[PDB]
Amino acid sequence: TVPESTARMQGAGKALHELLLSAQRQGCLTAGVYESAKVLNVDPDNVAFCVLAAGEEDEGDIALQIHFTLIQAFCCENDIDIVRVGDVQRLAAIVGAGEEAGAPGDLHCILISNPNEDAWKDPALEKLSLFCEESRSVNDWVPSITLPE
Amino acid sequence: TVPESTARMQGAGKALHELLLSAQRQGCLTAGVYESAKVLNVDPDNVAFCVLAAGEEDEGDIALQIHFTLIQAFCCENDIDIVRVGDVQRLAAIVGAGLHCILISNWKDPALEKLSLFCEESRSVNDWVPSITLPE
Amino acid sequence: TVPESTARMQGAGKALHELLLSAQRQGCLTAGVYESAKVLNVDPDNVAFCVLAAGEEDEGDIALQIHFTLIQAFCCENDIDIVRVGDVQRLAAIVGAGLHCILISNWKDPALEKLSLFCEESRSVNDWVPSITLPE
Amino acid sequence: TVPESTARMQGAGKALHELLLSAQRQGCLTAGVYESAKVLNVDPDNVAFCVLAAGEEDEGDIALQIHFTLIQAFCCENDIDIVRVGDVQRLAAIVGAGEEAGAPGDLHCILISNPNEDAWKDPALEKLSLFCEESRSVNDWVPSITLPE
Fold first, then answer.
1. Which of B133, C20, C80, C115 would be a feasible disulfide site paired with C75, CB 3.0-4.6 Å?
2. Domain map of chain B by residue range?
3. Nearest CA in chain D to A63
4. What whole-number distance in Å separates Cα of residue D12 and Cα of residue A133?
5. Three-class SS of D107-125
């Protein structure tokens, strides 16, 4: 069967897809490494979730990876759930500025913050939090989520 | 029941166990971050495998993590298979000197073939540096 | 008497004072580390000058320092003149928003010509990113 | 006159030259970034001085510079005097493995540790320490030493 593709993992990917869309819709998604870093540096207290996205090429972009080292360390230090994802383009397609793209749709970092408008408390958030708990409990500290696709 | 516990994952764990043991029954096996980094800087054309190992304790060790980052970026650049292990003590049960990084250098070995396939299968689903659960 | 207090250094300080003032009497002048880093990532063909500023307080700010490192390496790669200033408050007396990095973008200006010569003269003696002492 | 070339600076460069030679001779010089890092990580308590050396090319070697960020931060945090120097080859020529070089003589980091054999207390060390004090007092935190040459 497909590598890494369990029900747990299938569910995590679907939840993330949903969370990215609802977060975007509710205006509580931050897109971009520098935009994300600035929020984490200024006021991190409302970020519920972080996604780091790097393609195979991005693995040898030392600057990008060093930024990842910093964001990830910060997230761990501040108990913010964080997953890695290996398809940058798909991430961009799901969020704002996808579907075609003059100058590549390439976001390497997303923060999802709490909307509290009296808003929707997406259960997708909860499932993903559980997923990351499930990873820690098996000593996978930097968990990845695969395309259910 | 039990996150990440696949047949594939299990065969991966055993294979890394075997591989680690094959080295240590030979020179190989450069141990530690600073040791390994020079090896990569000096002679990376001969290195076949890398294992980064860290516990939850080490997530706020920015020095160690920056090095994990530089090691990982290099291996990926230079097509060395590389893997994360999360249980530093269980790794220590297989080998001494503690031990956050292991290089395997100048191979057929069912274990090495198998792990090599494991890593390509991870790449298939965009997991460029996958985690391995050691057995016991 | 007074370390680093050369005629050349003095003319450098005044020229940076003037340059900073010329911008702020214009768009230019991207302020701050995260701001500047995107600018460099996005459109570095238009950036003419960088100033990293930090105090003794900031030497153990590894986040800030890693960014100083990435900014500096980029500028050198891409031939943007870049300079270190050691008095963050005295820098603040010239410009608001506090402020560890300043980009100047899309120039003749005696100050900019002069600083451009200053930086080449630093390179002459292998000082790739020199310090400037602001006057007052 | 030559940029940066004051008596203070002329003296600093000569002192450093001397310190590199005496340290080498007394077997209390550590050569290399990884060798240096390991000493600083294991037991830093006997290192008196650090030299970081990078040529113009080295300025765009992100890995090297990140190592520099770490060594330098550590040195500042632990009050070890540290200077930067911009001629790697000359540094190598002065220390071991210079004068010709099969596979370039390229050391990017030197630590000088206390010899105490009942040994020579090089005054060059003292002058350089003073030099670095003189730099701090003028808000030049990462001081450089130029070739008197």
1. C80
2. 1-136
3. D62
4. 56
5. CCEEEEECCCCCCCCCHHH
CA count, 13 A, side-chain hemisphere, A53:
24
Q: Which CATH number fits domain C1-136: 3.30.70.3450, 1.20.120.420, 3.30.1330.30, 3.30.450.20?
A: 3.30.1330.30
Give the chains touching B; criterion: ≥3 Cβ pairs < 8 Å.
Answer: A, D
Q: What is the DSSP letter of D97?
A: S
> CB of C110 within 8 A of CB of C15?
yes
What stretch of H or E contains B70? helix B62-77
Amino acid identity at C118: F
Start-to-end C-alpha separation, chain B: 19
Q: Which residues in chain B are followed by a discontinuity, with C-to-N distance exceeding 2.5 angstroms?
A: 98, 106
CA A111, A114, A116: angle at the middle one, nearest 5? 155
CA-wise closest residue to C106 among C43, C37, C35:
C43
Among D residues 53-112, those touching chain A with beta carbons less than 8 Å apart: 62-63, 66
Last residue before each break in chain A (C–N > 2.5 Å): none
CA-to-CA distance for D138 and C86, rounded, in angstroms?
8
Q: Does A147 touch chain B (CB under 8 A)?
A: yes
Picking from B2, B74, B126, the nearest residue to A87 by CB comes out as B126
CB contact under 8 A, B38 and D34: yes
Closest partner residue to A142 (CB to CB) among B2, B6, B84 is B84
A141 in contact with B at a CB cutoff of 8 Å? yes
Other beta carbons less than 10 A from residue A10's beta carbon = 15
Pairwise CA distance, residues D78 & D76, whole Å: 5
The residue assigned the tokens 């929020």 is A39
Residues 17..36 of C with a Cβ closer than 8 Å to A: which?
A: 34-35
| Resolution of the experimentally solved model in angstroms | 2.4
Where are the extended beta strands (E) located within chain D? 29-31, 47-53, 81-85, 109-113
Beta carbons within 8 Å of B26's beta carbon, 6+ residues apart: none
